[PDB]
Write a protein that binds this ligand. Sequence first.
Ligand SMILES: Cc1cc2nc3c(=O)[nH]c(=O)nc-3n(C[C@H](O)[C@H](O)[C@H](O)COP(=O)(O)OP(=O)(O)OC[C@H]3O[C@@H](n4cnc5c(N)ncnc54)[C@H](O)[C@@H]3O)c2cc1C
Ligand SMILES: Cc1cc2nc3c(=O)[nH]c(=O)nc-3n(C[C@H](O)[C@H](O)[C@H](O)COP(=O)(O)OP(=O)(O)OC[C@H]3O[C@@H](n4cnc5c(N)ncnc54)[C@H](O)[C@@H]3O)c2cc1C
Lengths: 466, 466
Amino acid sequence: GHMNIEALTAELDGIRIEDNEKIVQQKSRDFYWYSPLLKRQLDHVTGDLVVSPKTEAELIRVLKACYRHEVPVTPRGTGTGNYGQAMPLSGGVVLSLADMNDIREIKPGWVICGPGVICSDLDKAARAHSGQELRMHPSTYHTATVGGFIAGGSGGIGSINWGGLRDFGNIIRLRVVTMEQEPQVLELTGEDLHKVTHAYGTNGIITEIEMPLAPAYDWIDAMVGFDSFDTAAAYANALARQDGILTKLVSVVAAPCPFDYFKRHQKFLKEGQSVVLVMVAAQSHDAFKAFSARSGGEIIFDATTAGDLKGLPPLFELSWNHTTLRALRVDPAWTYLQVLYPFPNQLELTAKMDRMFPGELISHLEFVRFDGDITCFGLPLVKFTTDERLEEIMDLHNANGCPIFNPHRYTLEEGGMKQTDEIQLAFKREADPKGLLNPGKMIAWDDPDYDFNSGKVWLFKGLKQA
Amino acid sequence: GHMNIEALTAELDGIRIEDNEKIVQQKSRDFYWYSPLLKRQLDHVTGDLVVSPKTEAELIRVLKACYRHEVPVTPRGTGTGNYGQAMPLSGGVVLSLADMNDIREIKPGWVICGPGVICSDLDKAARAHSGQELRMHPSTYHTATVGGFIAGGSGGIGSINWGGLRDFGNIIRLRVVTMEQEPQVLELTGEDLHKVTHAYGTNGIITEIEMPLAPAYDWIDAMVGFDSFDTAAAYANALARQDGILTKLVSVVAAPCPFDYFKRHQKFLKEGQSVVLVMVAAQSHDAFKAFSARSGGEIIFDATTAGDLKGLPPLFELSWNHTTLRALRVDPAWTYLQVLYPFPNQLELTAKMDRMFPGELISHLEFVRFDGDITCFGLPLVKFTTDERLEEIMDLHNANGCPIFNPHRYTLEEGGMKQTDEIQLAFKREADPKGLLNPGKMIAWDDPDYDFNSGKVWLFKGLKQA
Ligand SMILES: Cc1cc2nc3c(=O)[nH]c(=O)nc-3n(C[C@H](O)[C@H](O)[C@H](O)COP(=O)(O)OP(=O)(O)OC[C@H]3O[C@@H](n4cnc5c(N)ncnc54)[C@H](O)[C@@H]3O)c2cc1C
Ligand SMILES: Cc1cc2nc3c(=O)[nH]c(=O)nc-3n(C[C@H](O)[C@H](O)[C@H](O)COP(=O)(O)OP(=O)(O)OC[C@H]3O[C@@H](n4cnc5c(N)ncnc54)[C@H](O)[C@@H]3O)c2cc1C
């Protein structure tokens, strides 16, 4: 309970605020509980107030009042993150951007919108306007905001074509408001916007996004079935390398996950079958069938031949961390890892990890472009037993050439994605000199003795060059 | 064969025919003369008449009459091939498809049209209709037909994104009419259409094409200048690997070719400078600038800053075999090779060839997707001296890990792209039992002893396996 809440509230007349304990608690939590460790470590976290600005002017009024009363501010889109990113470690204000949902420009190849736009609503507008859609979106498409995807996410559906938010070009411009005595507006383009990507809101509030757009095609859901995980992974790798077959998703989900946890599609599945989830553009569908017939890929579900699709979720809601959701809804002991299998050894590495952890781990791959190669990331399911065994499983992945981005952590550095360097530290001081933006999420800000120059493989490498 | 030209002509009343010697001679030649060897070997080739059907029904009348009166038929789009593909080795009919140029359907992601449509005309229509365009096109964009591209070409602008016509999905369907007593209409989909791709019209006439479409963007021309070929190639490889920076062309042209032969752009160039030719989508242009600043790439020409300049060719008319056009326009002694530098060793290999042939060869790379990797093909310029030295340069490329697709040959097999296998031979026997379609272009048809299972690296691999 921050000491200055009464005075801060008195300065916010006319701005929508909420101090009801139950609502504040709900809006102080994301999906951190996918991690048993975070579920325990973050159980006591709650804010003091939820503040919901409608416009950038209201946001500036809120930040100015929080700065002068030194009340921490933790941004929130819609709170669908998995690492506790939007959770206020120091209490204070949960700053919801959900009402800043303008969509102000759609052009051939790009869109300009506010941070609170839900991904699926952005696509609804871009499709109606000119048959366009986002290049990539999280499997939380229907619930997650664009601003929270940029500040807290990394990629997802469409990464097979475009890579991820780590890559130049997948975001065009970020307009950011600083936490200063007089909040400043920064228009970040070029490499500068990459200081903000996956920074958990610690270096400014995104108030406008310019992102590229891609063509909205008739994407056809298909599942390809296999009697082993290795054969499924080999097929998915080969399909992902078909440069003329346009896909939006290529996932591998190892048995027993599909038959056990993909309940609505169960009529298309059988016990022991691993599956490859595919979204294929209608103009590439015939070639996909011809390639699959040549490549030993049995199509066990095709949205164009399956008949009545009523009640079936889109295959993307069986992919990415939706795969984890489907498993933990049936058995809550399942958690997950985040893994890279570096090119060109991804088939051998995924198989080795699969064999190393029988029963305890269920393999799950997502094929993506990564540094110009086609490879796969992993979201393997892990049956939680003890904290120590979970750390050991992750240590073993790292020691066997499969870098881990630890999702059982709530800080930037320990999560393995957003590298801290001198430029990141200088920018946080520029955008948040008092350290009021999402405190506790950046270890190097709190600890001048912390060695931020360790950590091997970073998904979002820092800007500083050699 | 018992050719009867008079009886053929009598059966074609109502169909446009040309027998003027000068016109027939012109329409019996392509750009074979880019090769000094082909210029000498094919100098005396001419047809007997040009027949120009306007409908598939007229085409069927022509083939039926040519079968009966044993008149060879050599298809022609607009005759921009480089290997003599459309040249009638046995005289007879030059079958022009230039008037089978209807545009039938444009939908999200696909087009249906006739073989005679010029690539730029197809794009002009698809852009006006729904902001779409071809995935790929040859540098002869404004002159070449789509049907001739499929039957005689391989890739080009856009291959950086989509691979080649060799790849599943870059063509959807080919409607083909056979040379049988009653010509048969085949609708080729799946793998079957790949029997006709790059077959030089030897196994049927394409009468309708269904190909995918891609989004039309504001493509920005830019040139990036370097003081050495190797640094230009390293930059271009890195740019090609930026998965979020959407490009349509990434070419490397070694000094002294740009300064000597890119005359209209001379004010932007300097002596000694190698160049990377880039087409970057407007929504990726700012990211391209930021990447270039971080990657040692000096932008020496940029269409967004150059102004509305008339008389400047698009950069793609300095790329692919337009680079060769420009060189031989100034010095007719230049010819070219076609090379693959196999992934992942393309930088090592291109440098080794560049240094092995100083002065006599000028390096030229085109970066493309190939089998799922990003690598480059080569169109190096070679100063012609003797036939023996030209053969030797190609032998040395092959012996140093750089497969040659020999452009100084006019047969399918000797050009290294279209492999003959038992499936290809059987299909010509089905579609052209009398051997009247483009005779002399397929060695295995005339040579029973031909070991068509030799050769190493084929660009268009046969359909047969296991
Ligand atoms: C089932 C499931 C599947 C998922 N699949 C994916 C996936 O495929 N890919 C993926 O990347 N993620 C995935 N996620 C994670 C998450 O859903 C997405 O990253 C999502 O886009 C986050 O947006 P949000 O609005 O929920 O952000 P929140 O959770 O509200 O916030 C995320 C972070 O962004 C910050 N933030 C939010 N808005 C702003 C702003 N305007 N300015 C500055 N900082 C801000 C918050 O402080 C926090 O640090 C998944 C989660 C679940 C539960
Ligand atoms: C300067 C220059 C640059 C070039 N750049 C490229 C490049 O980047 N990429 C590339 O791939 N090529 C390139 N080429 C080669 C050529 O321009 C293209 O391949 C072009 O698309 C061929 O089409 P066309 O209509 O000119 O065919 P033509 O030359 O008329 O014919 C080509 C072949 O197709 C056959 N054919 C034509 N129409 C049909 C039909 N309807 N049915 C069956 N067979 C048919 C002909 O018999 C012949 O075998 C270039 C050539 C030049 C001179």
